[PDB]
Amino acid sequence: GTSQVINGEMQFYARAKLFYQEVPATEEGMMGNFIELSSPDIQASQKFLRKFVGGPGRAGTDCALDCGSGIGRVSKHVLLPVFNSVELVDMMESFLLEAQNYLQVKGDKVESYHCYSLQEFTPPFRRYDVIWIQWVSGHLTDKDLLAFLSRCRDGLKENGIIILKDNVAREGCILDLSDSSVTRDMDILRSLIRKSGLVVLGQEKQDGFPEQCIPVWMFALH
Amino acid sequence: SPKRI
Ligand SMILES: Nc1ncnc2c1ncn2[C@@H]1O[C@H](CSCC[C@H](N)C(=O)O)[C@@H](O)[C@H]1O
């Protein structure tokens, strides 16, 4: 009867899968209605990342994890130019298959394609200098995000960091029924980061986006 | 992705 459809958590995840089943495995697909914002997104990510990697006490540059990778847009444009290797994790086999083509030029530097939902994924223990989490945290419930962030801490090499990049609402938590995601406000997101046992090393707001867009923020965590 | 809102 209605016992599954009324399980909000179950439907939240199921509806997100149904959405991504129809998203093309292309940069435009990854960017939703905003392909023109890929360029300022990347530039901001490049500027932020470089402040937290390299040299004394700062993260290493050997291996990164691209969480909610999709086809690997962040891996191609942000991570692979900095790290000696990368791994991807995404729930969609479709995107991870296409990633092998999208990332072919550096295909030998992509050590694993992990097909998991993040709420069911344990980042390999102490494997990564950076764990990058972009435009996927809003697809986890608060309890699942909290637990995933805690697991991510255990995925870090010495001096490693997590970089979280996502939309941040003015107030509350706002559900988007179309893609089955939530936008969290700053207070809620920062609370979940704190409750996970992480501390914020730095933060920066995304510049160059339209005034009509939800604000986007980057956080460096450890 | 980005969003409007
Ligand atoms: N619960 C979940 N676990 C793992 N991946 C998920 C997920 N919910 C959504 N995703 C993935 O999150 C991605 C969102 S689109 C953004 C892709 C990439 N971060 C980029 O910045 O270009 C999709 O690839 C989708 O399949």
Residue numbers in the entry:
A (entry chain A): 57 to 278
B (entry chain E): 1 to 5
Publication excerpt:
To determine the molecular basis of different product specificities between NTMT2 and NTMT1, we solved crystal structures of the NTMT2-SAM binary complex and the NTMT2-SAH-SPKRIA peptide  ternary complex. Despite that an unmethylated peptide was used for crystallization, a methylated α-amino group in the N-terminus of the peptide was traced in the crystal structure. Our ternary complex structure shows that, like in NTMT1, the substrate peptide is deeply inserted into the binding pocket through hydrophilic and hydrophobic interactions, and the α-amine of the first residue (S1) points towards the sulfur atom of SAH. In the NTMT2 complex, S1 fits snugly into the channel, where the main-chain O atom is anchored by N223 in NTMT2 (N168 in NTMT1) through hydrogen bonding (Supplementary 2b). The substrate residue P2 is sandwiched by the aromatic side chains of W191 and F90. The ε-amine of substrate K3 interacts with two aspartates in both NTMT1 and NTMT2 structures. In NTMT2, the main-chain N and O atoms of K3 are involved in a water-mediated hydrogen bond with the side chain of N223 and a direct hydrogen bond with the main chain of I270, respectively. Substrate residues downstream of the S-P-K motif protrude from the pocket on the surface of NTMT2, indicating that they are not essential for the recognition. The NTMT2-SAM binary complex subtly differs from the NTMT2-SAH-SPKRIA ternary complex in that the turn of the β-lid of the ternary complex is shifted closer to the catalytic core, which facilitates hydrogen bonding between substrate K3 and both D232 and D235 of NTMT2.
In order to unravel the molecular basis of the substrate and product specificity of NTMT2, we determine the X-ray crystal structures of NTMT2 in binary complex with SAM, as well as in ternary complex with SAH and an RCC1-derived peptide (SPKRIA). In addition, NTMT2 contains two auxiliary regions: an N-terminal α-lid (η1, α1–α2), and a β-lid (β6–β7) inserted between β5 and α8. These two lids cover the core domain that contributes to the substrate recognition. We also identify that N89 serves as a gatekeeper residue to control the entry of substrate into the active pocket.
